[PDB]
């Protein structure tokens, strides 16, 4: 159908569609639009008017314009040729290596498997980060929510994980830079290309890049998310390939959504937060999992709006989590990389079963130690400290040491750190703590544990201190 722009009030483009309309979601191409300015019908605003969303720039647009419904929602290239491609929301290589000639296009609304249709079971993958494995072990399909500060090394950490994993794990990847920092994509690009994770010698990689940068219209930023989402299901089911889905940042997705909701002259709930906040997510999150045909494992960055987590958005987020790594800024600030919170850098899916029962127990003990230890912090904070009792003091230290030991150097940020990163075998970790649990590092000080890999090296490090 063709519609006329009756209102562009911002990028809420109200088009009254005039050869009828198709249903909602159907993607419209604005006629007279320079590039393909797809408007996605979002609402039948009624009266054969739709409220639509422009995802392009609207500047300079003569209103009253004519939009021709593309007659369906947006479809975007699918097939392996997308790995090693930076696609924008609308497919369109922002790899700009010329086209991604794919055989499949897909409308970005992909769906969720019914109960029966999804592998109803979990796995245990691991990560090689002490802190992680120990507290939040891994699995596949699992969406992990990662909190904290990009480039504290939050963002870096993600990469590092990718760095070992995509390579190591075959099962493809999606990287979704939602409101991506373009620059960060660039550098990274030269790096990826370089890295051979991205292969350009072969259009594919092991990984497809989706960048939906900040400068895009929110609709675009919001929607780039579904796009990527669509892809991974393609890879899973179609390609087998077990995507690791990097989302940076689902909050930035969200933001684009909320902002949108507002403009959608809806009621975007408390804090302005979109009414649909949840539904957007639910519908989305369920489009992620270990189906029978594979797993789309999500590594979900969630940067924290106004840095609060009691914030509904993270509240929502939680509902879909499988593991969560909540970085602690306090910890990060304490000059600890990893930046972890040791209280919700979690997996429910750590169980004596899922990990070693020991692993788990050791962890529970640890989790305990920290948990108790925190309790002391307040007291200590007020009151100086020393008369609590020494065993506790020991735990305290141990905890700190543990803290320091959780601080695990990183090679990718060796550049900064001078610290040679360490990805740590599971045992060393388990042991690490066990040893610490055995409290052996008597004499040995706190900083002897800072930024090491396997626990010996810390012991060693005390020695290096000496």
């Amino acid at each position: 159908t063709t519609g006329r722009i009756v209102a562009v009030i911002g990028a809420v483009v109200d088009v009254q569609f005039d050869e009828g309309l198709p249903p909602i979601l159907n993607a419209l191409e604005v006629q007279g639009r320079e590039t393909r300015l797809v408007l996605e019908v979002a609402q039948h605003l009624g009266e054969s008017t739709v409220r639509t969303i422009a995802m392009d720039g609207t500047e300079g647009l003569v209103r009253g314009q004519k939009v021709l419904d593309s007659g369906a929602p947006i479809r975007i290239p699918v097939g392996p040729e997308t790995l090693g491609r930076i696609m924008n929301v609308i497919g369109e290589p922002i790899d700009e290596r010329g086209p991604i000639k794919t055989k499949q296009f897909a409308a970005i609304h992909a769906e969720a498997p019914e109960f029966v249709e999804m592998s109803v079971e979990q796995e245990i993958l691991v990560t090689g980060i002490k802190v992680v494995d120990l507290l939040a072990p891994y699995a596949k399909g699992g969406k992990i929510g990662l909190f904290g500060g990009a480039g504290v090394g939050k963002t870096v950490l993600i990469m590092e994980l990718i760095n070992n994993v995509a390579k190591a794990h075959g099962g493809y990847s999606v990287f979704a830079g939602v409101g991506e920092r373009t620059r960060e994509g660039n550098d990274l690009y030269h790096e990826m290309i370089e890295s051979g994770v991205i292969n350009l010698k072969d259009a594919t990689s092991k990984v497809a890049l989706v960048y939906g940068q900040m400068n895009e219209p929110p609709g675009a930023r919001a929607r780039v998310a579904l796009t990527g989402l669509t892809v991974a299901e393609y890879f899973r089911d179609q390609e087998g390939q077990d995507v690791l889905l990097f989302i940076d940042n689902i909050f930035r997705f969200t933001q684009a959504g909320s902002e949108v909701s507002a403009l959608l002259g809806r009621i975007p709930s408390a804090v302005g937060y979109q009414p649909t906040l949840a539904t957007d997510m639910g519908t989305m999150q369920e489009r992620i999992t270990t189906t029978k045909k594979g797993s789309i494992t999500s590594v979900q960055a969630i940067y924290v709006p106004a840095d609060d987590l009691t914030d509904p958005a993270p509240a929502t987020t939680f509902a879909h989590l499988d593991a969560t790594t909540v970085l602690s800024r306090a910890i990060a600030e304490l000059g600890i990389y990893p930046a972890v919170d040791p209280l919700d850098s979690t997996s429910r899916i750590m169980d004596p079963n899922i990990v070693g029962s020991e692993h788990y127990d050791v962890a529970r003990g640890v989790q305990k130690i920290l948990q108790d230890y925190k309790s002391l912090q307040d007291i200590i904070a007020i009151l100086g400290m020393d008369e609590l009792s020494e065993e506790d003091k020991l735990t305290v230290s141990r905890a700190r040491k543990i803290q320091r030991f959780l601080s695990q150097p990183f090679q990718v940020a060796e550049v900064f750190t001078g610290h040679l990163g360490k990805l740590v075998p599971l045992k060393e970790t388990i042991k690490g703590f066990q040893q610490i649990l055995a409290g052996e590092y008597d004499h040995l000080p706190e900083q002897a544990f800072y930024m090491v890999g396997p626990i010996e090296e810390a012991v060693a490090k005390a020695d290096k201190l000496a």
Binding site: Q16, D18, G46, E47, S48
Partner: protein, 167 residues
């Protein structure tokens, strides 16, 4: 802009916003009444199910309706502004409003020229007079009935409460 002819009755907004258009329009050229009456006429040319059935019904969803009642029905002799202002209200949905617009108008040569006193004793018969307290006694030859609708009952009311009012 064009200074506006706001002779009340009218209603001041409320298709006084409309009315006043024609309180300047009709008014200029003094088709005031000419049109005042166009409307009257029109009204019932409406009030049969032209009115329900498509007229105030869109089920077609007014979009073609307003582009066919601009021309199948707005197709008339009532048209120096009359159909055109219709053709303005139409899209602008104020078709559902029309009695009142007319009302507003019609209260103009018909009743601008009215009457109104209403004490508790009165409740005027509103007859069309530009002057007052005259007609207002002719009323007593009018006076010959009612439940004291136009002008009042002053019985339950005045008086009836009074005994109460003392206690």
């Amino acid at each position: 802009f064009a200074k506006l002819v706001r002779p009340p009755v009218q209603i001041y907004g409320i298709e006084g916003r409309y009315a006043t258009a024609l309180y300047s329009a009709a008014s200029k050229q003094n088709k005031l009444e000419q049109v005042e009456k166009e409307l009257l006429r029109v009204g019932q040319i409406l009030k049969e199910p032209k009115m329900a059935a498509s007229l105030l019904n869109p089920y077609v969803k007014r979009s073609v309706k307003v582009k066919s009642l601009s021309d199948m029905t707005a197709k008339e002799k009532f048209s120096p502004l009359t159909s055109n202002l219709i053709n303005l209200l139409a899209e602008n949905g104020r078709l559902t409003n029309t009695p009142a617009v007319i009302s507003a108008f019609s209260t103009m040569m018909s009743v601008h020229r009215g009457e109104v006193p209403c004490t508790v004793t009165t409740a005027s018969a509103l007859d069309e007079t530009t002057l007052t307290e005259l007609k207002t006694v002719l009323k007593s030859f009018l006076s010959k009935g009612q439940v004291l609708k136009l002008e009042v009952k002053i019985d339950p009311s005045i008086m009836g409460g009074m005994i109460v009012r003392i206690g």
